[PDB]
Design a protein around this nucleic acid. Structure first.
Lengths: 78, 97, 105, 93, 97, 78, 108, 90
DNA sequence: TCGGATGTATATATCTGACACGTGCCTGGAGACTAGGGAGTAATCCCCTTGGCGGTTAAAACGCGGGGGACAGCGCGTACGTGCGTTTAAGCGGTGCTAGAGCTGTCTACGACCAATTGAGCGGCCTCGGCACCGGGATTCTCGA
DNA sequence: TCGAGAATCCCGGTGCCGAGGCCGCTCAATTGGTCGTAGACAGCTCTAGCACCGCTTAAACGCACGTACGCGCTGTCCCCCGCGTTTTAACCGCCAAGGGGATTACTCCCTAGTCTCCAGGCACGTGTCAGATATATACATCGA
């Protein structure tokens, strides 16, 4: 039950960074759900890369490749 | 005995977290969530701290963009508070179902 | 006696390394003589523009060392570089400080 | 593990532009990832262009067309001009 | 004088234009527009019929997708009519602007 | 100009296919503008493709390649 | 000299192993191509084509038509929940759009 | 000119023996096959380049399939691919 | 509009930990020469794309109700900011240590590659049945009453 | 409820042209050998990821109170839909031509390939200063 580990003030901080003034109650649950979906999608490809590499450790480069395949290029890790 | 009128503390924060770059989510809970999610794909799978940090930052940026989109959608509806319907509209327009 | 191809073209980026990477990338059966020179020139110009914007953005903050935040500010503020890197996330970069006019009181 | 990077060359470019500045390690890693991404993007577009015209050689014409396709307007014009200038100087010497 | 209620002749034609697979834009004006737009790139160009047909199909699909997205945006703002602010909202959320 | 060749009934038919009940008067000009922008974006890439082949005819391959470049793959033309 | 049995028949497929091998070799994907890679790719392509054609034929049958047209392709792609996201960024020429009217817009 | 026309027709008749296909539908099927082929081949080549491998084998194509096909599609695709590979080897 | 009480940069000392500089060496980038194959050049010639003319008319432009929806104003009560004690757990520092990534050494089974060669797939020619279309009829929404 | 009116599905009859099949008939996929070598496999090393353990403290949280505003209700009014009337240029068929997009033949010159050597750039060690941090001050603003 670590999806609740992303606390309500964390979502509030992210919304403030995005520039949001007021927050509804259901926003926390909805953002937890969408984050869970996004991490599932990215980690699926990362683990697939790890499987194809015959490795048991997920290096940052595999995560970079998974993000690139999803249309979200990441700079600063390789 | 004073009190800050609603709205000012939201900006005292919106400016603070926009002018400064941080992670905004506790490292260990997010790492535990990442490991829990990855457990459903491969058992006893190890990770790297760099990979955890990359996932952290990617999730931060994704939600930040999603929050900008949903804020704009809420403002379009003559509103200020963001509702879950705003998130759903943003995700449907972006194509993420 | 030996002169590097980078200096022969008046460039800084490695023409030889670009040629080797073009050979190794399985991009095509053969690589022309001037293709690595052209690609290195394009990369050099793009890096020159990026570093110039990063440097003057950093100087705007009275910092003489360029950090990823300065890179993010430089890329997002410029119209064309933002278009080129619209779907790119810069680690530890942050976002442009902007608040919608309706939100202000 | 002889890892290759673009550190020295990008540092040279910075000293060419701003002689009194420096790059942090994270920012330099972002520079390396930016140049690698742009290089692979242009090379892939040039390979696609060569394969589309039944051509089996990457020349300056293919790189020119690729950079014209990927970069925005004024960026494309400036990059094409600088690349042609570099190609001509290389050819002269 | 039988007068249909304003609104039924909308959903009626909507069923028809969703059931059909036509191109909904007169071919000659669109070809003229394509020739004009390409005139600003190269003088004295020639266009194959397949090329203009592909351009028309792509524009058709793009515009129907944009119209679906802006309909969703207009619905979100508690409205039935689509207005330009919905158009820029959809285009901005889609990352175009 | 020729952008006026995209008539108001054409915009109405496109909205109907998209599933829209009522059109405001300002929709037509904005739709013409966005259509012009999209056509310029695609035609630039198509014409560059036909220049690279040293050809003065814009084939269907150039159009489909341009559309695929902007992530708008089109099926049915070669 | 023995009988020239095709590789597709040897693998029990319908898509060409030889042609896919040639396209993989000439596509500049890799310096070398394994023996089983064309077989695997031909099998995957054949399965995908079979799924698309099955759903397209079902859609055509729903329309009381025998021959398959692009409209049936569009219906088959956009009705399924996986082929839709596999082909979410593509457009089917003359395929139109699937019928969908928002419940809010309906009268009463 | 190379086209998957007869091959798609054979698959159709295997699945729907009493169903025809139009020329435009056949062209769309050919375009779909080419797109999926180039996508999977590009992903396999990318995997080989990432893992410093000079050849693409059934493993690379399998991983590319798993990456580019969602959920049940990937499972059935890898099932058919493994079946065909096992049939071919024996 | 201001007494006044905050979180807003500003002004200056202290570590301090990343940063840029000697450095050396080995390994990939230059010079040197072949050759032979991809590509430019030349001719050609036939498809097809541009151009334009006449007839039909489906479609577009325009005008006129008028009604239903966009929008402004008010009331409310309801959910959402704000201090605050706390308690909950998160970084922060130190070590154990061990699965596991990374680099080495055989060498073997697998992938080019080239000489027949042949059957499968491609181009051209019927050819007829699916499907588009039209016209009359039964059937199903609709909107004023 | 409801019935005239208006679409709408439907079914029969007619046409016509693309889907399909057949028949040559090239050419590229198959066989069968060598020939080299990529990575398959086993093994050694060292390294960084996992686990614990305790500390100090940021912050998460559950809880109160005030009130901003999200939403519903009322009303206005205006502009967009539906339909009738009047252009009009889109469409279809046709013919003409020229031009340029593919082809075939011929060099030809440019890059893959191989041998040699060297210098540069990357891993290593290190002295150094750009900047975070701690402490006190100007200062644009919620209530009468």
């Amino acid at each position: 039950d670590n999806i609740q580990g992303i606390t309500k003030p964390a979502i509030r901080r992210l919304a403030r960074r995005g520039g949001v003034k007021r927050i509804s109650g259901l926003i926390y649950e909805e953002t937890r759900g969408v984050l869970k979906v996004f991490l599932e999608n990215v980690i699926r490809d990362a683990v697939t890369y790890t499987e194809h590499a015959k490795r048991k450790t997920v290096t940052a480069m595999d995560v970079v490749y998974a993000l690139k395949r999803q249309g979200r290029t990441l700079y600063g890790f390789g | 005995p004073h009190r800050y009128r609603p709205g000012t503390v939201a900006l005292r924060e919106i400016r603070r977290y926009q002018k400064s770059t941080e992670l905004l989510i506790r490292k260990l809970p997010f790492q535990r969530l990442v490991r829990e999610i990855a457990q459903d794909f491969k058992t006893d799978l190890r990770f790297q701290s760099s990979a955890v940090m990359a996932l952290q930052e990617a999730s931060e940026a994704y939600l930040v963009g999603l929050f900008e989109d949903t804020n704009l959608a809420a403002i379009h509806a003559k509103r200020v508070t963001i509702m879950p319907k705003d998130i759903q509209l943003a995700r449907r327009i972006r194509g993420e179902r | 006696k030996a002169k590097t191809r980078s200096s022969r073209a008046g460039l800084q980026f490695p023409v030889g390394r670009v040629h080797r990477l073009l050979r190794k990338g399985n991009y095509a059966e053969r690589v022309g003589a001037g293709a690595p020179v052209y690609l290195a020139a394009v990369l050099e110009y793009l890096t020159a523009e990026i570093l110039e914007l990063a440097g003057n953005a950093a100087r705007d903050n009275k910092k003489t060392r360029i950090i990823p935040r300065h890179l993010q500010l430089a890329i997002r503020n410029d119209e064309e570089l933002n278009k080129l890197l619209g779907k790119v996330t810069i680690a530890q970069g942050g976002v442009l400080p902007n608040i919608q006019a309706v939100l202000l009181p | 593990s002889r890892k290759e990077s673009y550190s020295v060359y990008v540092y040279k470019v910075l000293k060419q532009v701003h002689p009194d500045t420096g790059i942090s390690s994270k920012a330099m890693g972002i520079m390396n990832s930016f140049v690698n991404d742009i290089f692979e993007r242009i090379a892939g577009e040039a390979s696609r262009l060569a394969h589309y015209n039944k051509r089996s050689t990457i020349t300056s014409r293919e790189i020119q067309t690729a950079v014209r396709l990927l970069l925005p307007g004024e960026l494309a014009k400036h990059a094409v001009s600088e690349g042609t200038k570099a190609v001509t100087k290389y050819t002269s010497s």
